[PDB]
Specification:
alpha/beta; TIM Barrel; two-stranded antiparallel ribbon; globular; binds a molecule of 4 linked components (MGL-SGC-SGC-GLC); binds calcium ion; cellulase activity; carbohydrate binding
């Protein structure tokens, strides 16, 4: 029903919109690294998230480094399984080339172009798909102008050869925080969005105002990853400031995906250790973070 209602997504003056120009706000979950916690990504768990949480988007976080796709490309099958599940379930799906320790997106540019050529040929005709070409560029010598924009300028045409219209989300500097630099030197492709990521126990008003700057320049922003914890993961969850951010995103209709769907023992994890991989979770199988995120997604779901 989600993709059935909205169909093809596009950007209109910085806003994510459906095929009739109506605002669309996607809320869902991100997987943790598919090379570590791939058992939580399957048709049953995505159905349970769709039906019980009300998600309308699922993000497949394909790490490149850290035992991910570069060393073992069999993780692509997990990405495929997620995409095909999303298509069956009628929800949107984000294919995320999850760089992090490989902080400059150009480190694996050739591989990224090959990977996105393959994904876009297989799935380009479905409106469900969203590409995220560089999770979190980071480092003082990784900038929008020198490193990230030019990367996007090479990868985007590769996807566009096969898929002329699906949304492409492009990471920004400082772990996808530097949306204002990107907004002052935007890509030309009309269906692009810039990533903005945050952690409720670490980031506040200063980054909120930076996001407002970017939006004021006409740039579209997709909060493709955010955590309820501190970036450090100490002190537990910070749901007070997480709720300020929730309202911030709602005021501006920003789409988001929470990090992350795993049973790992870290505050941002949505599930408790031992939680069922195929969903159907009791309330005891959800962490404090998961309980809160589920509530945020349910209360806006139809
Ligand atoms: C300005 O300071 C920086 O801010 C950034 C946030 O804007 C910080 O980036 C964030 O760093 C977090 C800590 O690494 C990660 S949490 C996330 O990803 C990490 C790394 O993959 C993993 S830890 C990882 O887990 C594996 C599986 O259990 C394990 O095998 C491996 O040994 C272990 O390293 C964690 O579980 C995930 O939640 C955020 O993704 C990132 O945005 C930056 O750290 C900080 O310097
Ligand atoms: Ca492996
Ligand atoms: Ca090709
Ligand atoms: Ca398409
Ligand atoms: Ca080049």
């Amino acid at each position: 029903s989600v993709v059935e209602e909205h169909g093809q997504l596009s950007i209109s003056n910085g806003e994510l919109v459906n095929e009739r120009g109506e605002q669309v706000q996607l809320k869902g979950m991100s997987s943790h690294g598919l090379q570590w916690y791939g058992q939580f990504v399957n048709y049953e768990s995505m159905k349970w998230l769709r039906d019980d949480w009300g998600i309308n988007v699922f993000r497949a976080a394909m790490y490149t480094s850290s035992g991910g796709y570069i060393d073992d490309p069999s993780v692509k099958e997990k990405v495929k399984e997620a995409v095909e599940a999303a298509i069956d379930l009628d929800i949107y799906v984000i294919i995320d080339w999850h760089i992090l320790s490989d902080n400059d997106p150009n480190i694996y540019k050739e591989e990224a172009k090959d990977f996105f050529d393959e994904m876009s040929e297989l799935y380009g005709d479905y409106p469900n798909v969203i590409y995220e070409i560089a999770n979190e560029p980071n480092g003082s010598d990784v900038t929008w102008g020198n490193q990230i924009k030019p990367y996007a300028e090479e990868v985007i045409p590769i996807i566009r050869n096969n898929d002329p219209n699906n949304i492409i989300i492009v990471g920004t500097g400082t772990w996808s925080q530097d949306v204002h630099h990107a907004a002052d030197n935007q890509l030309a492709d009309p269906n692009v969005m810039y990533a903005f990521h945050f952690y409720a126990g670490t980031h506040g008003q200063n980054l909120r105002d930076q996001v407002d700057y970017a939006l004021d320049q006409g740039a579209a922003i997709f909060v493709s990853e955010w955590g309820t914890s501190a970036a450090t993961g100490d002190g537990g969850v910070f749901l007070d400031e997480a709720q300020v951010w929730i309202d911030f995103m709602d005021e501006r209709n920003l789409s988001w995906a929470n990090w992350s769907l795993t049973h790992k023992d870290e505050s941002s994890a949505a599930l408790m250790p031992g939680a069922n991989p195929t969903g159907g979770w009791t309330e005891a199988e959800l962490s404090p973070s998961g309980t809160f995120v589920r509530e945020k997604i349910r209360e806006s779901a139809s």
